[PDB]
Structures are given as C-alpha cells and as structure tokens.
Amino acid sequence: WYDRRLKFNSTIKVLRLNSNMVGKIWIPDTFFRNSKKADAHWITTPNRMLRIWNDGRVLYTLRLTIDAECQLQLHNFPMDEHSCPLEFSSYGYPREEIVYQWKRSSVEVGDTRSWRLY
Amino acid sequence: FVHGVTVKNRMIRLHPDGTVLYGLRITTTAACMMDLRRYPLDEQNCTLEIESYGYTTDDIEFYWRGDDNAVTGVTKIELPQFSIVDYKLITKKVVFSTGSYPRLSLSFKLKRNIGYFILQTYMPSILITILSWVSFWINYDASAARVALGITTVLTMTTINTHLRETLPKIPYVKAIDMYLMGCFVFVFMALLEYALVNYIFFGDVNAIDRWSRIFFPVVFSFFNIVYWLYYVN
Amino acid sequence: PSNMSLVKETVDRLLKGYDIRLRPDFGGPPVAVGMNIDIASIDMVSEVNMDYTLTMYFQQAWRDKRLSYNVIPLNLTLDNRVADQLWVPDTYFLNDKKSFVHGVTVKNRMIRLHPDGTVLYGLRITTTAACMMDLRRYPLDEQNCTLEIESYGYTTDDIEFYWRGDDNAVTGVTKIELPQFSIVDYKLITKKVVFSTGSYPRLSLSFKLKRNIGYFILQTYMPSILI
Amino acid sequence: YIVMTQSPKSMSMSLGERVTLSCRASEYVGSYVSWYQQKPEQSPKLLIYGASNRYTGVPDRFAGSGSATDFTLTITSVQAEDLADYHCGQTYNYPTFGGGTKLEI
Amino acid sequence: EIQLQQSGPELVKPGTSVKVSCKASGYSFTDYNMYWVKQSHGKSLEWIGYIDPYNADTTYNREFKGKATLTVDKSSSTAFMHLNSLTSEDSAVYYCARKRNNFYFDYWGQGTPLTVS
Amino acid sequence: DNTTVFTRILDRLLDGYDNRLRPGLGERVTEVKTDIFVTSFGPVSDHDMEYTIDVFFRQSWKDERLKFKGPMTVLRLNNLMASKIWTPDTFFHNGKKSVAHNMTMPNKLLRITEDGTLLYTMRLTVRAECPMHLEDFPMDAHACPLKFGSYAYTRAEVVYEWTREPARSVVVAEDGSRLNQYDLLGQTVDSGIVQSSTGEYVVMTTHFHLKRKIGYFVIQTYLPCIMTVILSQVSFWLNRESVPARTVFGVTTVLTMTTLSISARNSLPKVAYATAMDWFIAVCYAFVFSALIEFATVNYFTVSKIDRLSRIAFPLLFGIFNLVYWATYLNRE
Amino acid sequence: EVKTDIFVTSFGPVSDHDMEYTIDVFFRQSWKDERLKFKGPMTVLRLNNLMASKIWTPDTFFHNGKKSVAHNMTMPNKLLRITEDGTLLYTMRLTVRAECPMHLEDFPMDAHACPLKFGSYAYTRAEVVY
Ligand SMILES: *[C@@H]1O[C@H](CO)[C@@H](O[C@@H]2O[C@H](CO)[C@@H](O[C@@H]3O[C@H](CO[C@H]4O[C@H](CO)[C@@H](O)[C@H](O[C@H]5O[C@H](CO)[C@@H](O)[C@H](O)[C@@H]5O)[C@@H]4O)[C@@H](O)[C@H](O[C@H]4O[C@H](CO)[C@@H](O)[C@H](O)[C@@H]4O[C@H]4O[C@H](CO)[C@@H](O)[C@H](O)[C@@H]4O)[C@@H]3O)[C@H](O)[C@H]2NC(C)=O)[C@H](O)[C@H]1NC(C)=O
Ligand SMILES: *[C@@H]1O[C@H](CO)[C@@H](O[C@@H]2O[C@H](CO)[C@@H](O[C@@H]3O[C@H](CO[C@H]4O[C@H](CO)[C@@H](O)[C@H](O)[C@@H]4O)[C@@H](O)[C@H](O[C@H]4O[C@H](CO)[C@@H](O)[C@H](O)[C@@H]4O)[C@@H]3O)[C@H](O)[C@H]2NC(C)=O)[C@H](O)[C@H]1NC(C)=O
Ligand SMILES: *[C@@H]1O[C@H](CO)[C@@H](O[C@@H]2O[C@H](CO)[C@@H](O[C@@H]3O[C@H](CO[C@H]4O[C@H](CO)[C@@H](O)[C@H](O)[C@@H]4O)[C@@H](O)[C@H](O[C@H]4O[C@H](CO)[C@@H](O)[C@H](O)[C@@H]4O)[C@@H]3O)[C@H](O)[C@H]2NC(C)=O)[C@H](O)[C@H]1NC(C)=O
Ligand SMILES: *[C@@H]1O[C@H](CO)[C@@H](O[C@@H]2O[C@H](CO)[C@@H](O[C@@H]3O[C@H](CO[C@H]4O[C@H](CO)[C@@H](O)[C@H](O)[C@@H]4O)[C@@H](O)[C@H](O[C@H]4O[C@H](CO)[C@@H](O)[C@H](O)[C@@H]4O)[C@@H]3O)[C@H](O)[C@H]2NC(C)=O)[C@H](O)[C@H]1NC(C)=O
Ligand SMILES: *[C@@H]1O[C@H](CO)[C@@H](O[C@@H]2O[C@H](CO)[C@@H](O[C@@H]3O[C@H](CO[C@H]4O[C@H](CO)[C@@H](O)[C@H](O)[C@@H]4O)[C@@H](O)[C@H](O[C@H]4O[C@H](CO)[C@@H](O)[C@H](O)[C@@H]4O)[C@@H]3O)[C@H](O)[C@H]2NC(C)=O)[C@H](O)[C@H]1NC(C)=O
Ligand SMILES: *[C@@H]1O[C@H](CO)[C@@H](O[C@@H]2O[C@H](CO)[C@@H](O[C@@H]3O[C@H](CO)[C@@H](O)[C@H](O)[C@@H]3O)[C@H](O)[C@H]2NC(C)=O)[C@H](O)[C@H]1NC(C)=O
Ligand SMILES: *[C@@H]1O[C@H](CO)[C@@H](O)[C@H](O)[C@H]1NC(C)=O
C-alpha cells in the first residue's frame, strides 16, 4: 500500500527493515473472516518484514498459520471437491476507506509435493 | 479470547454525534447446563449471559439497538448435529445484594438432529433386536444353533454400547438412549432365557410353548417400542 | 506510621542504585545459591510421552550484601512484584518440556530480604519435565526420573549451587501418592558439569519411581492367564 | 442453631487434681469453639480460643483440645483461684453457648 | 485498656420498654461488631443480636426478632440496646461483648441486671 | 464539577503509597476478611483427580493509607488502578491451573470506602486438585478442598478470616451444579495453621462435600455383569448331553466380560488398589469362569447328577455375594 | 556474516502422524558488530536478557518450523556475551517443532532425512549471510 507520509528522498532506494518497525507504522487491520484460530510465528523473532521505498510504497509481509474454516459438506464422501476459501478483509475500515485489489501474480502456490494435503 | 491474526481483531469508529461503535470478534466457550435426560430426543436450551461487572443500573444500561435486528446471522448457521429452532433476546435487570445490575440474555433453543442419530445409534440396536427374533424360527428338536445365534446378539449389543459410551456423558438418569439400549438388551436376554426354559421343559405341549413364545415376543417388543417412542417423542 | 515509613525508607534505600545486570559480588568469588524444594504434587506420569508433570515450591536462597539492612529487626517480606527489580539466578531446568509459574491471584513469587542480606526467592512452578523412560521391563520396571537444575549463563567461577540443608533440602516427597507409581526413594546430587565453554554448576533431583503392579496385575495379566 | 451439650454438669474435684470437661456439638463446628470462665458476679473470661489455642494473659494450666464435634477442656492442677463456672461456645454459625459448669472442692 | 462500660442495674414494671447502653473504650469502635448476650440466673447465656456499627446492619436472634432493637451512636462510641414489652421471664443480666475474630469474644461488659416485678 | 472532585481524589489516593509493603507493616497484622460465591461447581474429572469451580472470590482488608474524604462514600477503581495498590497475594494450595477471566475487560472490581476498607471481588475459574481415594468407587463420597492463603506473608504478617459467620461466608448459586455424576451435598469451612519450610501460614480450607451418583454405573456396568452371570447359571440348566451348546454358551459368556471390564476402567485413573468396582467385576469374572470350570468337569463324565449341585449352589453362592457386597458398600459411609 | 551453530540438547519424538519432529537445541550464533566495541578489564561482558532486546539480533526464523517455543522457565533461556572486539555470541534454547515431509511408501523400513532449514526473514542474501 502506498503511504504519502513514508516518503524519503535519498540515495537509498529502499529501507529494508526487520519486524521492530511493524508496530511503529500504520498497518492494515486485515483479518481472516473464516479463521477459527490463527497465529503469526515468533521464534526466533517475529516473522515479519517491512520494506519502504522513496515513492511511499510499503511491502509489509508476515508468516501466518491459519486454521481456516471450510464448509466441508459430506453428502457424497469421499467424492467432495471443495473450494475452501480464505476470506480476509479489514475488520473496521469500510469499503469507502480500504480497498483490496489482487495483482496478477498474487497467489504463488508452492511445491505441492511436500504439502500435508493428503 | 479475541482473535489476534493479523492484528488484534477489534474496531473503533467515532461517529460525528458522539456515538462510539466499539466491536470485537470474540470466540466464547460459554457454559450451558445440559439436561441430557431426553437425549438424543432432546431440545437443549443454551444462553449467553451478557452483564456488566462493576456498574449497577444507575450508571450503565444495556439494550438491543433494534428490537430484534440486534442479533443477525443466526439463520445461516448450519450446526452439524443441531438445528437452531429459535432464538430470543431478553433484557432483564437482575437484583443482587449490592444493587440492580443490567443483563442481556441471548438464548438459542437448539434441537437435536434426530436424523443423524437415528441411523448412528438407534438403527444398529433395532436391527440387532430384529435378529434376535430370528432365533425363535429355528427349531426345538435340535436348537444347538439357536443358542449360538442368541448368545452372539448380546455380544454385538455390548460392542455397540462400548463404542457409544465414549461420546456420551455420565449423567445417572438413563437418558433416552441408555434406556432403549438396556431395554433391547433385556429383550434379547429374555429371548435367551426363553430358549433356556423351552429346552429345559422339552428334555425334562412343548410345541405349544414354542409357538406361544414365537407370537408373544414380536408383539411385546412392538409394545415396548411404541411405549418408548410415545414417551420420548413428546 | 513511623515504623512503616521507616521501613519504606529502608526499602527505597536498598532498591536505590541497584543494578539488576550484575550478579552478587561481581568481580569476586562465586555466589553460593542454596536451593530447597517442596514437592506439592507429582502427577500424570506420561509413559507415552516419556515425561511427568511436577508441581513444586522452588525456593532458592542466596547471599547479597547490597540488600543488607540493619535498622529493621524483622524479616521484610516485600511484595512479589519486586522480584523483577532484583537480581536472581538465571536458573533453568535442562530437561523441562514446558513450565509456567501459577497465575492467580497474583504471580506466585516470594521475596524476603533478611537483615544480613540473604534473599529467599521462591516460586510455585509447574513443570512437565521429561525423563527418558526405559520401559523394557514395563510394567515390572523402575524409572530414574530427574529434574536437572542448571545455571544457563554463569559458570562455576560466578555461581555455585548446593542443596540448602543437604538431604533435608527436598521435602514432601513422602506424602506424594501417584496413582500407579510408588516413589521408592529420592536422591540429591551436586555436580559441576564440564561443558565446552567451561565448568557449569549443576544440581540433580532424581526420584526412583517404581511401578505399582496392582492395576497391571488386576487387568493385564489376570484376564490373559484366565483365557 | 447449634446446641452446645456440656456433658459435665459440675465436679467436686479436690485442689491440685486433674480436672477435665467436655463440650459436645450436635453438628459440625469446625474448630471455632471457645471456652469461657465466669466467676460469680463477674463477666465471662476467655481461656481457650480456636479449640486449642490459649488466649494471651491466661495461665498455662488450662489446656484445650479436641476436633470438630468433640471438644474438651482440661486443667492439670486446679488451684484455689481457678474455680468458677465453665461454659463453652461455638462461632461456626450464629453464636450458641452451653450451660455453665462449676468447680468445687 | 479496653473496657466495655454499661449503664447499670435497672428496674421497671412489666410491659414497659427499657433501653440499656454499652460504652466501649480504647479500640476503634466501628471496626469490630458488637454482640449483645442475655444470661438468666444460673442459665446458659443466649445471644440477642449483633449490630455492625459502621453500616448499622443487624441480625437478631429468631427468639428475639422484634423483642430487641439495636442502635449505635458514632459520635459517642456507645452501643444501645432497647427492649420492648418487658415481662417477668425476661428478667436477667444483659452483657455486651466484642467479636474480635471469628473465634472468640474478646471483651465483655460489666453486666446490666434487669428486674421485672 | 462533581467529576473534578472525584478525579482529584483518585489522583491523590496513590500519592505516597508504596505497594511493595502490606498495610501496617511492622505495626500490626493485616487481617483479610474473605468469602466466596460459587457461580457453578464445575465438572469433577476423576481421571485427573480434579474439579473445576467458577467463583466470585471476594476479600476485604483494612488499609489506613487509602483514606479519603469526599461526597462519595465508595470509590470505583478500574483494573489499571487495582495493580498500583497492595492486593493480598492469595493463592490456592491445590490449584493445578486457574484462569482470571478478563473478557471483555479484566473481571476485577476494587472499591475503597471512606474509612479505608477495601473490597476486591474478582471472578476466577480454579481447577483445583482433589485427592480421590477411590476405594469405594462408584459408591463413594469425596470432600474436595479449596485451601487458599497467602503465598509469602507468614501468619505473623497477614491472617485470613471469613467476613461473615463461617457457615454464611461460602455461598453456592442455586443453579450452580454442573456435576454429571456428582451431587454437591454441602460446603464446610475451617481455618488452621500450616507448617512450611519458610514459616507458618494461615490456610482457609473449604471442603466441598460430594457424593458420586451411581445410577449410570448401575445400568451401564453392574446390570450387564449381573445379567451375564445369570446367563452363565442358565447354561447349567440347559443340558449335559448337548456338549457343543454348553461349550458355545460358556465361551461367549466369558468373552463378554472382557469388554465389560475394559469399559469400566477407562474413566478411572490407574490406581493400584481395586476401586471396589473392579472388585465386583473380577468376582463376576471368576463366577463365570467357574461356571466354565464346572461345565468342563461335568463334560468329562459324559442324569445331570453332577450338575444338580451346581444348579442349586451357583444361584445361592451368587446371591450371597451380591447381598454381602451391596450391604457392605452401601452402608459404609 | 552470522556464524551459526547448533548443539542438539535432545532430539525429541518424531510425530509420525503429523509428519513433524520435535528437537531441543542450543541455537548459538555469533556475528561481528563494530558498534558494540568496548575496552575494559573483562574481555567478555555477560548481559541480561533485558539488554539482549536493545541490541540488533538476526531474525533467524525456521523455514519449516511449526509452533516453536522458546523456553522461559525460570527466566528467559538466552545469554548474550559481547567480546572486546565486538564479536557477539547470542546463545538461546529452543524446542522447534520443525516439519519433516515424510514419504511413507517404504514403511516400516522408511528412513527420512528430516531437514531443519533456517535463515533470515527480513534480510536478503546481500545483507545477512549465514
Ligand atoms: C486478557 O488476557 C489475555 C491473556 O490471558 C491478554 O492477551 C495477551 O495480551 C498481551 C498484551 O497485548 C500479549 O502480549 C503480546 O505478546 C506478543 C507475542 O505473544 C506471543 O507469545 C505469547 C506468550 O508470551 C503467546 O501466548 C502469544 O500467542 C497468544 O496470543 C496470540 C495473539 O497475540 C493468539 O493468536 C494465540 O492463539 C495465543 O492466544 C504469542 O505467540 C508480543 O509480541 C507483544 O509485544 C509486542 O507488542 C507490545 C504491545 O504493547 C509491545 O509493547 C512490545 O514491545 C512488542 O512490540 C514489538 O514487537 C512487535 C511484534 O509485532 C512489533 O510489531 C513492535 O513494533 C515492537 O517491535 C505483547 O507482549 C499476549 O500475547 C496476549 N496473549 C496471551 C498472553 O496469551 C489480553 O490482552 C487480555 N485482555 C483482553 C481484553 O483479552
Ligand atoms: C431458553 O431458556 C431461557 C432461560 O433463561 C429462556 O429465557 C426466558 O424466556 C422467557 C420468555 O421470553 C422470559 O420471560 C420474560 O420475563 C420478563 C420479565 O417478567 C417480569 O416483567 C416485569 C419486570 O420487567 C415484572 O414486573 C413482571 O411481574 C414480570 O415478573 C417479561 O417482561 C417478558 O415479556 C412478557 O412476559 C409475560 C408474558 O410472557 C408478561 O409478564 C408480559 O407480557 C411481558 O411483556 C418475558 O415473559 C424469561 O425471563 C427468560 N429467562 C429465564 C426463564 O430465566 C428462553 O425463552 C428459552 N428459549 C426459548 C426459545 O424460549
Ligand atoms: C528471619 O528468619 C531467620 C531464618 O529463620 C530467623 O533466624 C533463624 O531462625 C531459625 C529458626 O528456624 C534458627 O534455627 C535455629 O538455629 C539454632 C542456632 O543456629 C546457629 O547455627 C547455625 C549453624 O549450625 C547458623 O546457621 C545459624 O545462623 C545460628 O547461628 C539451632 O541450634 C536450632 O536448632 C535447634 O532447634 C530447636 C530450638 O533451638 C531445638 O529443640 C533443636 O533440638 C535444635 O537443636 C535452629 O536450627 C536460626 O538459628 C536463626 N538464625 C539465623 C538463621 O541466623 C530470624 O529470627 C527471622 N527474623 C525475625 C523472626 O525477626
Ligand atoms: C519470560 O519471562 C519474563 C519474566 O520476567 C518476562 O519478562 C517480564 O515480562 C513482563 C511482561 O512482558 C514485564 O512487565 C512489564 O514491565 C514493564 C516495565 O515496568 C517497569 O517500568 C514501568 C514504567 O514503564 C514501571 O511503572 C514499573 O513499576 C517497572 O518499573 C511495563 O511497562 C509493562 O507494562 C505493560 O504491560 C502492562 C500489563 O498490565 C500493561 O497494562 C501496560 O500498558 C504495558 O503494556 C509490563 O508490566 C516484566 O518487566 C518482564 N520482566 C522484567 C525483569 O523486566 C518475559 O516477558 C517472558 N517472555 C516470554 C516470551 O514469555
Ligand atoms: C538416578 O540417576 C542419577 C543420574 O544423575 C544418579 O545420580 C548419580 O549417582 C551416582 C552414584 O549415586 C553419582 O556418582 C558418584 O557418587 C558419589 C557419592 O559419594 C559417595 O560415594 C563416594 C564413592 O562413590 C565417596 O567417595 C563419597 O565420600 C560418598 O560417600 C559422588 O561422591 C561422586 O562424585 C565424586 O566423583 C566424581 C567422579 O569421580 C567427581 O567428578 C566428583 O567431583 C566427586 O569427587 C559421584 O557423584 C553421580 O554423580 C550421580 N549423578 C549423575 C550420574 O549425574 C542416581 O544415583 C540414580 N539413582 C537415583 C535413586 O536417583
Ligand atoms: C487473480 O486476480 C487477478 C485480478 O483480480 C486476475 O488477473 C486479471 O485477469 C484479467 C483477465 O484478463 C485481466 O484483465 C485484462 O488485463 C489486461 C492486462 O492488464 C488488460 O489489457 C485487459 O484489457 C484486461 O483488463 C486483469 O488485467 C488481471 N489483473 C491485473 C491486475 O492485471 C487473475 O486472473 C486472478 N487469478 C486467477 C483467476 O487464478
Ligand atoms: C526530495 O528532494 C528532491 C530534490 O532534491 C525533491 O524533488 C523531492 O520532491 C523531495 N522528496 C521528498 C521531500 O519526499
């Protein structure tokens, strides 16, 4: 997300920072609307990064482990293909104030071989 | 607990007039006294009891903004083993020793889904009971097979009961389930005893004993089933 | 209020200019940190997970000249919240899988500054210590489960452990009644483990648990021999 | 309420002799029983509190004992000044006292 | 020296209400609730009711519910007991005590004889 | 203007207050009046020998430092202020785990009267430890305690007493009984000293008297066992010439008791001593096994002379055992 | 340059069902820092856990970690020694429950080379090299 306040003009093109600055700056209060229980990993230190450019770009990212809820109906079992969702949106900010927009290279699925998707 | 991912799920919204819209995403394991004496044919009633801790009705006051719209999204809920027949909202003012405190009591009148448990629990027991009736047909001149067939059924009952007890609590009253299982146990046991009696008498008229037992068992079992269903269905 | 005001002045003097970062008598001989334990209960000996749950009052007394006071004749017992403002041994249980200090009503800690300077730090710790269980002869087996106590950072030159009262340091084990284990005997050891960095101080409290065969003889062997 | 059944109505024990009393309780009273000594024309005086613990300023001759539903007061060697009316009491509920018990030579 | 001074002996005809006071000393009056106990001649002493001075709450014995009304003065640290509809049977000596803890009645009053001829 | 006075009083309360020291340190003991209101007696986990209990732990102590004079007789202090004053460090001597509920906000209420008295009602969920000597299980009664007292302050520093009469100072909510197979018969209290390594402490015991409800075990366990035993006897009645029938009946009868015994033990902890339920199950197991033994003995000989004695003996001996067992355990208190 | 090293205190149980294993490790790791340079009587200055948070440390997360816990009984199990030159030594005790992808096709003879991949989270290859 762009942030007009976090603009700096210097030879440094990007301020690559650790998790220490996550709390200091504004963060979108995103939450997963079907997460029964989730937590961000903390060992060794909070798994979070924060990169900032001159133009005001921010690239806050973090690692999460969501135990998302999926309406797994078993009318025909085992036969049930499921499109399990991961709905997430700002908890408080209205649509008029926070808009989430996918990019074409959004969901980079990893190596499915090592998944526990058995 | 209030969910924490990504940030602490919580809202503040200072409206221009002054109204502060404060909201949290909460998960609660609220307690609900279960009277599982009609279980599985039970209509467990559960409630959430919102109440102020340190403030009396003089200082604070709770109401459902919107007479009934204050509760939403209940209908879309699809409980696995339950159906939310109704929900009601009450706004009491309980009187304690210190003073009158506010109170809001959201209530859900859950109804057990008999469709699941009729096949999960009742159907095997009933089927095994039917198998017990098959014993009477066999013979009386040579019924060494009848004894084996009869005595296997109680073992089946015991296995079914052992697997069932894991899910259930230990309330002393028979509940709707243990009473039926034990009654079916009694019926099959009495079938074994009937075989014992007829075999003893014959080896000690006999045909009449056989046929009277054969007619008696289905009708009395049907009476038991009718009585049980009538008693617990209502 | 003269007495209590004077005691407040004394405590303020003690905590004035007190550097928690420095162990007692820094740049000096090792500080002798006595330990004494009162086993509240031992329960849930999880053979499947190879560990046991220990609940204990973990006292650890040590001398400290900075906190010495003489005006007050009695033993001050300050609030448990002052522990964070005082130095303590960096003790840790080596074979602990998970442990916590009990919460309610307040964090269960104790501080007691004696006139000489001795501080009787104490905690009510519940720990699920793990002991490698040799179940080759189970159920007719014994287990030498232990709670290795060791100082994480300091070396033997800086800190020294010892059971206070020696064999009387550990108390209350006799009263314990585990469901299927008889605590035949307990033994207290003092060691100086030689690690790569140096010789660290060590204490070991080992309970030689013995399996109660009454339940196993009741349910395991009897039906089998009958069959 | 709780009734305090003072078994010994009175005793004629001689001086310097072992003397004992009993203070039965109908229902559980924990250990809150207390004993009082009432000399004639004088208010009751506390001797033992909390069943066993002896009140301050009391001569050590008196010695309480006993658990819930069984309470006894004993004196090793009764003296001349240690003769008066003895009635126990319990405070596990609203207070109730038993009948007096005198000492005579 | 804590002393529980009382008014003194009183005599009055039957059916006439009477009041008896209990003056404490030394210890903080409001801290420990007062107990009023009646003792007939050679009979077991019986408790009437206790009046926690601070909030003036009271709890009277069932047999004396309404027979005695207990009040207290905060300015003058004195506890007042008032009896109504006196009879011959009620004649006795009335004592006011202090319940120091849950265990024992520490201090007791001098004693107030009551006579109903 | 009322708020200005109130906020100034709250500002001036903590001035000069050192929460590290209990009230009147070095002058007098800090008595602590106490009482408990049990919202609901949680489940009794016999397997772990523990019971959960949700309580409104109240406790009052005189403090002279927190004296204020103003229009309000009682002040209200938020949970933030409650952490800046000396609250007694009470704990539960048998508390395996306890949660201080704090949703939506810390369930703590602190009030300060003008004289300096305090009231610190708070809501807790104590999973205390109840040592269960399950010798007469199922027909057994357990008086689970809730001992609590100071952790650091010796008996010469803080003493715990019940605010009302000891009988009136522990209250159980009328609907507060979440026991599946227990009945909270009543509550009793006591206060006694305990000797420890550090010193002597006052312990406020509270024995919650419970008796296990026995109907579920009767229908689930005892009835099948008794019925199976009776079926074993009827095997005698059948015949002696029909060897296969007797064999089948006996072997299946033995088979059932294995499942029955296994089911009963799963709930209990693995206490070495027989809990008097395994005792009954084992006696019935021996009875059915003896029925098999007698069946084999008669089978060796290959009318019904040997089996008449067993036919009369087994019912008689079994009735003797049943009557003796029930009379012994039921009467035992 | 962060010079890491591991001393496995105990190789915890291998969770066959969940395809993960527990491992208790003394996760040591040193790195040169010129800012924390001091000359004094003592070459090594042991620091309390409070000071450890106030100085930079490598955010060495575990690439296949799942529900890892850093032991805190009694106090936090982690020291931080600063040598005179500035060669920090940041030792800590962990119980990482790393993820081990198991292909149980050759059961029960199946053998698995369970990994413990770990590296910086916020710093690329050009800022923090292990
Ligand atoms: C009712 O009681 C409950 C507890 O009974 C309270 O919940 C606790 O509240 C405190 C205070 O906010 C939380 O402390 C925070 O912990 C963060 C890490 O927590 C992790 O470790 C703990 C064990 O120590 C785990 O229990 C946590 O997991 C639990 O919580 C998460 C959600 O957090 C749940 O999803 C889980 O399921 C568990 O329930 C975590 O694994 C810690 O990082 C944080 O410290 C940062 O933030 C504070 C905020 O003031 C800063 O002061 C501090 O300096 C840190 O800030 C640095 O680091 C952040 C990292 O993001 C950077 O962004 C900053 O810029 C800066 O560099 C804080 O200490 C506690 O986790 C939480 N849960 C507990 C104890 O279980 C409720 O608050 C209380 N009230 C209500 C209304 O419920
Ligand atoms: C699941 O289980 C819960 C148990 O908690 C049930 O909750 C109860 O629901 C009933 C019905 O909704 C509630 O009854 C209500 O009582 C209110 C209070 O009555 C007093 O009102 C004034 C004070 O305001 C007094 O002066 C007066 O004398 C009454 O004593 C009523 O105000 C409510 O509305 C109407 O009640 C009756 C008619 O029913 C009349 O008095 C009026 O017409 C009044 O408008 C209502 O009656 C009860 O309080 C709830 N709590 C309980 C029982 O603990 C749930 O209902 C149940 N689930 C379902 C689906 O039913
Ligand atoms: C603050 O807290 C401290 C610690 O408790 C109190 O001081 C100690 O209190 C203990 C009581 O538990 C005392 O213990 C007794 O010590 C006697 C002498 O000990 C001296 O020698 C030892 C070395 O052996 C020194 O370590 C010690 O400091 C003393 O110099 C022993 O003889 C006693 O044993 C006897 O106990 C009883 C009664 O005497 C006998 O019947 C037994 O048979 C046995 O022989 C006992 O062990 C200790 O002495 C006290 N002093 C200390 C620790 O220096 C403070 O009183 C307290 N402050 C207060 C209350 O204001
Ligand atoms: C492993 O175990 C250790 C054991 O010590 C934990 O370390 C303690 O952690 C707690 C909580 O994180 C610390 O408590 C905090 O202390 C801070 C500093 O207090 C001093 O300074 C303030 C002024 O700033 C003084 O008023 C005070 O008297 C002290 O002198 C407080 O500022 C903190 O307040 C925060 O939490 C409270 C909770 O009520 C909030 O209300 C506040 O708004 C604020 O957010 C807090 O009280 C404690 O200090 C730590 N110990 C030491 C020695 O410092 C580790 O946290 C633990 N780690 C893990 C991972 O489990
Ligand atoms: C459960 O498992 C624990 C494992 O920690 C066992 O603890 C070990 O126990 C053994 C023996 O009990 C310890 O081995 C040695 O014990 C000696 C006991 O001292 C007496 O005996 C010696 C002669 O054996 C006499 O000289 C002495 O005067 C005493 O009479 C210690 O003295 C030993 O230490 C000495 O030797 C070592 C090695 O030579 C030196 O390095 C020391 O500095 C010192 O000079 C030694 O401790 C062993 O130390 C214990 N700890 C371990 C192995 O970690 C339990 O015994 C076992 N059983 C139970 C019931 O818990
Ligand atoms: C994930 O979501 C993104 C966007 O929400 C999907 O990518 C979008 O795909 C549409 C389909 O063509 C693109 O529309 C076309 O884009 C081109 C290039 O910008 C433009 O020239 C055309 O006129 C037309 O608008 C759209 O651009 C593209 N999003 C972006 C940001 O370019 C993507 O397919 C989704 N992933 C799935 C479905 O797996
Ligand atoms: C940075 O400075 C340049 C000129 O040196 C200016 O054009 C630019 O707007 C500045 N950016 C800021 C202040 O964000």
Numbering used by the authors:
A (entry chain D): 82 to 199
B (entry chain E): 105 to 308, 459 to 488
C (entry chain B): 6 to 232
D (entry chain L): 1 to 105
E (entry chain H): 1 to 52, 52A, 53 to 82, 82A, 82B, 82C, 83 to 100, 100A, ...
F (entry chain A): 9 to 310, 388 to 418
G (entry chain C): 39 to 168
Per the authors:
Here, we isolate native murine GABAAR assemblies containing the widely expressed α1 subunit and elucidate their structures in complex with drugs used to treat insomnia (zolpidem (ZOL) and flurazepam) and postpartum depression (the neurosteroid allopregnanolone (APG)). Using cryo-electron microscopy (cryo-EM) analysis and single-molecule photobleaching experiments, we uncover three major structural populations in the brain: the canonical α1β2γ2 receptor containing two α1 subunits, and two assemblies containing one α1 and either an α2 or α3 subunit, in which the single α1-containing receptors feature a more compact arrangement between the transmembrane and extracellular domains. In all three classes from all three datasets we observed two α subunits, two β subunits and one γ subunit arranged in an α*-β-α-β*-γ clockwise order when viewed from the extracellular side of the membrane (asterisks denote subunits adjacent to the γ subunit).
To investigate the molecular effects of insomnia treatments on nα1-GABAARs, we examined the interactions with either DID (inhibition constant, Ki 16.9 ± 1.7 nM), one of the major metabolites of flurazepam, or ZOL (Ki 22.9 ± 2.7 nM) and nα1-GABAARs. Both compounds engage the receptor ECD at the α1*+/γ2− interface, which is spatially equivalent to the GABA pockets, each sandwiched at a β+/α− interface. The binding of DID in the two-Fab dataset is reminiscent of recombinant GABAAR structures in complex with diazepam or alprazolam. DID makes extensive interactions with the receptor, including a hydrogen bond between its carbonyl and the α1-S204 side chain; two hydrogen bonds between its A ring chloride and the α1-H101 and γ2-Ν60 side chains; and several π–π/CH interactions with α1-F99, α1-Y159, α1-Y209 and γ2-Y58. Binding of DID or ZOL causes only moderate conformational changes in their binding pockets. We observed a slight opening of loop C due to a 1.2 Å displacement of the γ2-S205 Cα, as well as side chain reorganization of α1-H101, γ2-Y58, γ2-Ν60 and γ2-F77, which enlarges the pocket to accommodate the ligand. Intriguingly, the minimum pore radius in the DID structure is 2 Å, possibly representing a partially open state of GABAAR that has not been observed before. Accordingly, we observed incomplete loop C closure—the structural hallmark of GABA-dependent allostery—in the GABA-binding pockets in the DID structure.
